[PDB]
């Protein structure tokens, strides 16, 4: 493709920063799904999801952002929200249609990310929306295989034993 303009770079920054007023000014049908070419090809939505910019996420979803957009590793925004623990964001994405069992290039799901990163409430959320805890990544590992021993709440959750 033809790359980014300065205005596109300004939009990616505003999305990561939570500068919602700037995002409103810069987001066009042509820019809303631009990619961060010099990073890992994150879209505005990837950034806003990863950095917990809930107002930005809301705006982007309402103005044509692609919930399914893949970064260089095949991560979709829901992966980013789950990795970094951002529950409201994850819920928003799921409400708009995010695929809860989506796999990146390494067959990691959002539940693998949440498990590995010790995010109990995210794991519970994903489970409440149909996440399959038996899915194996390219290493043969389930989400449970990625849970630290100190996260016994998550271990119980994924075994079937949580309140």
């Amino acid at each position: 493709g033809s790359g980014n303009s300065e205005a596109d770079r300004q939009l990616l920054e505003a999305a990561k920063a939570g500068d919602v007023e700037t995002v409103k000014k810069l987001c066009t049908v042509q820019s809303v799904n631009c990619r961060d070419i010099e990073g890992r090809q994150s879209t505005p939505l990837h950034f806003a999801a990863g950095y917990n910019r809930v107002s930005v996420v809301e705006y982007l979803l309402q103005h044509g952002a692609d919930v399914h957009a893949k970064d260089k590793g095949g991560l979709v925004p829901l992966h980013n929200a789950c990795s970094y623990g951002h529950y409201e964001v994850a819920e928003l994405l799921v409400k708009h249609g995010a695929v809860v069992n989506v796999a990146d290039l390494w067959k990691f799901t959002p539940l693998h990310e949440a498990a590995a990163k010790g995010k109990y409430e995210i794991c519970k959320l994903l489970l409440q929306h149909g996440a399959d805890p038996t899915k194996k990544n390219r290493d043969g590992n389930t989400p449970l295989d990625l849970v630290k021993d100190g996260d016994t709440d998550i271990q119980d959750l994924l075994r079937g034993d949580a309140a």
Binding site: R40, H46, F47, Y51, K72, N80, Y84, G85, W106
Partner: peptide, 8 residues
């Protein structure tokens, strides 16, 4: 496997 963008 490289990290997605974000913080938390």
């Amino acid at each position: 496997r490289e990290a997605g963008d974000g913080a938390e």
